Amino acid sequence: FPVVLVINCGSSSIKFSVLDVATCDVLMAGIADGMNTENAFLSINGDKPINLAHSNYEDALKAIAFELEKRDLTDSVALIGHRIAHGGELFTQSVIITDEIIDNIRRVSPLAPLHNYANLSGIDAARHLFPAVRQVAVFDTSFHQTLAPEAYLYGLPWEYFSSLGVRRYGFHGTSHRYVSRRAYELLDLDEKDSGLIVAHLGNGASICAVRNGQSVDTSMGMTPLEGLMMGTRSGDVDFGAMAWIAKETGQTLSDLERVVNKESGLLGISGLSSDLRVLEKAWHEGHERARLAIKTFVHRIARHIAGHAASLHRLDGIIFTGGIGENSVLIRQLVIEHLGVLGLTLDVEMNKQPNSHGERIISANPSQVICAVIPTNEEKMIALDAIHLGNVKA
Amino acid sequence: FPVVLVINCGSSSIKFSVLDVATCDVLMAGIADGMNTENAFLSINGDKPINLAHSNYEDALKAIAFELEKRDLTDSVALIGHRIAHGGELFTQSVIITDEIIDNIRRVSPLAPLHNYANLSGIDAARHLFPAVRQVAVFDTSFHQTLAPEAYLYGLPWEYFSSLGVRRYGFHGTSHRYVSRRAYELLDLDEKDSGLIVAHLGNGASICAVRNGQSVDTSMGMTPLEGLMMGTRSGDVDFGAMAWIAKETGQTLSDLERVVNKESGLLGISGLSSDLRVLEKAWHEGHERARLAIKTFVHRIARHIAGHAASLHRLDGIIFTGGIGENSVLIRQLVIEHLGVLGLTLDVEMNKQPNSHGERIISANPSQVICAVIPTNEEKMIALDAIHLGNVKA
Numbered sequence: 001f002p003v004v005l006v007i008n009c010g011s012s013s014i015k016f017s018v019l020d021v022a023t024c025d026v027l028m029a030g031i032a033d034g035m036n037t038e039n040a041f042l043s044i045n046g047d048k049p050i051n052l053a054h055s056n057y058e059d060a061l062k063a064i065a066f067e068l069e070k071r072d073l074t075d076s077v078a079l080i081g082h083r084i085a086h087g088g089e090l091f092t093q094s095v096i097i098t099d100e101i102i103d104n105i106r107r108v109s110p111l112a113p114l115h116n117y118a119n120l121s122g123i124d125a126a127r128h129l130f131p132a133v134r135q136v137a138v139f140d141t142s143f144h145q146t147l148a149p150e151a152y153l154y155g156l157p158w159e160y161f162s163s164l165g166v167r168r169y170g171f172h173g174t175s176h177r178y179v180s181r182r183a184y185e186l187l188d189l190d191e192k193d194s195g196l197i198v199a200h201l202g203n204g205a206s207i208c209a210v211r212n213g214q215s216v217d218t219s220m221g222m223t224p225l226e227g228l229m230m231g232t233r234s235g236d237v238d239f240g241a242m243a244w245i246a247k248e249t250g251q252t253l254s255d256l257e258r259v260v261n262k263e264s265g266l267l268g269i270s271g272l273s274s275d276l277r278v279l280e281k282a283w284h285e286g287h288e289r290a291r292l293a294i295k296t297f298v299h300r301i302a303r304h305i306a307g308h309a310a311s312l313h314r315l316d317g318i319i320f321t322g323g324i325g326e327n328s329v330l331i332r333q334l335v336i337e338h339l340g341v342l343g344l345t346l347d348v349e350m351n352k353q354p355n356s357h358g359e360r361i362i363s364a365n366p367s368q369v370i371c372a373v374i375p376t377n378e379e380k381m382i383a384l385d386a387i388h389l390g391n392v393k394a
Numbered sequence: 395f396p397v398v399l400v401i402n403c404g405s406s407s408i409k410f411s412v413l414d415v416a417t418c419d420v421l422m423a424g425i426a427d428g429m430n431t432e433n434a435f436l437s438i439n440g441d442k443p444i445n446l447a448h449s450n451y452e453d454a455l456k457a458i459a460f461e462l463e464k465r466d467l468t469d470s471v472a473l474i475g476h477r478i479a480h481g482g483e484l485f486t487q488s489v490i491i492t493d494e495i496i497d498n499i500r501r502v503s504p505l506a507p508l509h510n511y512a513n514l515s516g517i518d519a520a521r522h523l524f525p526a527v528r529q530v531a532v533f534d535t536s537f538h539q540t541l542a543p544e545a546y547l548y549g550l551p552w553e554y555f556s557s558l559g560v561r562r563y564g565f566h567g568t569s570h571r572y573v574s575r576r577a578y579e580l581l582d583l584d585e586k587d588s589g590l591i592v593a594h595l596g597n598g599a600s601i602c603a604v605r606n607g608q609s610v611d612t613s614m615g616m617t618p619l620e621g622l623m624m625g626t627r628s629g630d631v632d633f634g635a636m637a638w639i640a641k642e643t644g645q646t647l648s649d650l651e652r653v654v655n656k657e658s659g660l661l662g663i664s665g666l667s668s669d670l671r672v673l674e675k676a677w678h679e680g681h682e683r684a685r686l687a688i689k690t691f692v693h694r695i696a697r698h699i700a701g702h703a704a705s706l707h708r709l710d711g712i713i714f715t716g717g718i719g720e721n722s723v724l725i726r727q728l729v730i731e732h733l734g735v736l737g738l739t740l741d742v743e744m745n746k747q748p749n750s751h752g753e754r755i756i757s758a759n760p761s762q763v764i765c766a767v768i769p770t771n772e773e774k775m776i777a778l779d780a781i782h783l784g785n786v787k788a
């Protein structure tokens with residue numbers, strides 16, 4: 001009974017899951033938090049934050065490796081999937097990890113300093129701990145590599161693109177890829193002739209236009225900071241305004257970069273929390289700035305959803321996914337009502353159902369565009385890619 | 395036979411026009427260029443760049459005043475219209491200029507340093523030269539003051555808005571206001587129940603959603619730098635990317651601010667020119683980067699046009715205006731074909747007609763949304779406001 005070990009090595013943690021190759025079901029999940037800190041712990045399924053204070057990425061993965069062995073899993077690990085934050089223009093699909101791939105991931109790391117290096121650390125440790133096991137890399141950016149130049153170019157001088165590689169990349173590619181594949185089935189669409197807009201709404205959020213199975217537009221840019229307003233991220237922001245602020249408060253780009261990434265968005269406007277659940281309650285209670293943060297959030301999502309639709313020849317569906325897209329009955333309705341111009345008609349009873357109802361349609365029949373909720377499963381998408389690559393000869 | 399003297403005092407020049415109060419026709423136009431420079435000239439209708447080297451804004455306006463007198467116009471000037479770049483949140487409509495208004499324009503000038511002060515200089519000189527004449531101020535931002543908070547707020551921490559006044563303002567308000575008024579007639583729409591998207595495309599470019607006669611969304615932000623990619627302006631740009639570039643080339647916000655405003659857009663990508671006519675020819679000749687600059691330009695316009703439509707309950711029309719919107723047969727068609735998702739159907743023969751055909755429809759009947767070209771006339775809009783205010787008792 002072979003299993004796949006999926007690893008998401010982040011800047012300060014290591015998320016992992018062990019899925020059955022047969023059913024792709026999760027058999028075990030966990031996370032090593034407080035990495036590189038004098039206090040690092042590992043909580044599997046949440047039964048006991050183990051101890052590994054002052055442990056590097058490989059030690060953390062070693063602890064994890066031992067727990068898999070303590071549960072006689074170590075021997076069924078036939079594949080290992082690595083989530084890679086940024087693949088530059090070098091990766092257009094998932095690959096079997098080799099020395100060449102490592103070199104290439106290293107070449108593009110300057111595009112995502114912190115994140116990519118943590119990804120390499122995780123690969124280095126995984127390679128050390130499971131030498132005879134095939135390993136693959138899944139990049140959050142590859143799905144968006146089908147975008148045309150007109151859609152990925154910035155209006156900056158050409159040199160910045162050709163020399164420094166400044167262009168739109170986009171993220172949540174694995175989710176967008178996974179969710180759109182699922183949509184073809186739920187909506188009974190022909191991939192080769194279809195137009196979908198997927199709204200991945202979580203702490204990080206982005207929109208993606210998938211025309212005939214291909215990504216043709218996405219909201220994040222060279223970095224995860226562009227596009228929609230998010231939990232702590234501002235989203236699109238007039239550069240003139242950022243420049244004006246700097247001269248006004250004497251702050252630097254670093255000062256401002258941190259504010260835009262860690263103190264803005266829902267948190268920044270509400271001055272309460274980045275958690276939608278908290279703000280939804282706050283608004284229900286009469287909090288004015290919570291209502292404003294949510295309204296602004298909803299307004300920007302609708303604006304990008306409509307804008308991205310311009311890259312489609314025909315709009316067949318709008319899919320909501322992610323922690324927010326899958327669970328927020330209110331946000332979904334507000335966004336949808338803010339898109340009445342597109343001819344959307346919501347079925348409230350359907351939209352009211354909790355996420356336990358899985359892949360479901362929430363628009364009424366009279367609706368010109370089908371609306372649905374499709375829970376994302378990036379671990380499964382990664383495992384599926386790994387499984388596919390498991391049949392290759394390298 | 396009273397006339398209105400319209401003045402656009404810029405950072406380096408003074409554009410002016412004298413319109414007949416009866417027909418609002420232009421009787422005389424001109425421009426004093428090279429202001430504050432050791433070489434300043436004044437070209438009326440283009441018959442003789444006069445001389446006024448080393449002359450301030452008031453001297454330049456004095457030269458202009460003399461030419462009006464030399465043509466016995468000075469005595470028919472019953473009103474003077476001033477174009478104001480930025481009105482902050484203080485101005486929601488055009489006003490009769492008084493000491494209070496001057497004070498208020500001065501209060502918001504920090505929102506547009508260079509520009510607004512030049513505007514005040516022009517008002518100061520006009521007041522000195524025509525004491526007994528009523529004068530009014532028309533702000534490029536007032537039409538957008540109807541935007542809801544959700545549409546004008548940035549995802550930055552609340553303090554920046556409440557304390558520093560950082561929010562979206564938008565520009566081209568006079569054009570958008572004038573053009574949308576004209577659209578109600580051309581399209582036989584009921585202002586009170588309508589949805590229009592106006593695309594002001596010139597060297598500076600912006601989109602605006604007018605719902606039931608009111609502006610509810612616009613593309614420029616706190617400054618003219620946000621939104622569409624323009625002649626020399628980049629348009630929306632991922633702040634993360636700007637931050638990354640800075641650390642990479644060691645440039646400052648000022649360095650980058652200048653590049654985004656003066657070396658980007660059509661000029662930046664084509665590395666040829668900011669003039670569409672030049673690039674259109676370049677592409678026709680096989681220039682690859684010209685074709686890319688134009689395609690990118692077209693792609694971003696379509697994206698914002700569709701996104702802005704989300705702020706409408708129903709899309710009745712899409713209006714093209716400005717130097718580019720009024721004259722570019724190619725760009726109009728490309729944008730429109732890039733919006734097939736909205737059900738637009740173009741009438742090529744109609745779209746082929748030159749601007750001499752004035753306000754005209756360019757979409758075919760089968761089209762779900764009417765498309766048209768409406769030449770903008772900001773001088774006329776200003777004169778009309780002045781005329782209205784001319785009947786008031788102050």
Ligand SMILES: Nc1ncnc2c1ncn2[C@@H]1O[C@H](COP(=O)(O)OP(=O)(O)NP(=O)(O)O)[C@@H](O)[C@H]1O
Nearest residue numbers: 201202203204205274275276277322323324327328
């Ligand atoms: N029942 C719920 N109702 C409303 N919002 C919810 C609910 N459950 C989670 N959320 C919200 O959605 C967010 C978390 O989304 P999620 O996709 O799980 O996280 P994330 O993996 O850290 N995002 P990203 O890191 O870019 O992949 C929080 O803001 C939550 O408040």
Ligand SMILES: Nc1ncnc2c1ncn2[C@@H]1O[C@H](COP(=O)(O)OP(=O)(O)NP(=O)(O)O)[C@@H](O)[C@H]1O
Nearest residue numbers: 595596597598599668669670671716717718721722
């Ligand atoms: N016949 C034409 N065909 C294509 N493009 C044209 C034509 N005439 C003017 N343009 C373009 O449109 C631009 C000038 O637009 P216009 O609205 O007149 O200028 P502007 O007043 O300086 N813009 P703004 O300063 O923000 O109001 C140039 O890029 C021109 O190449």
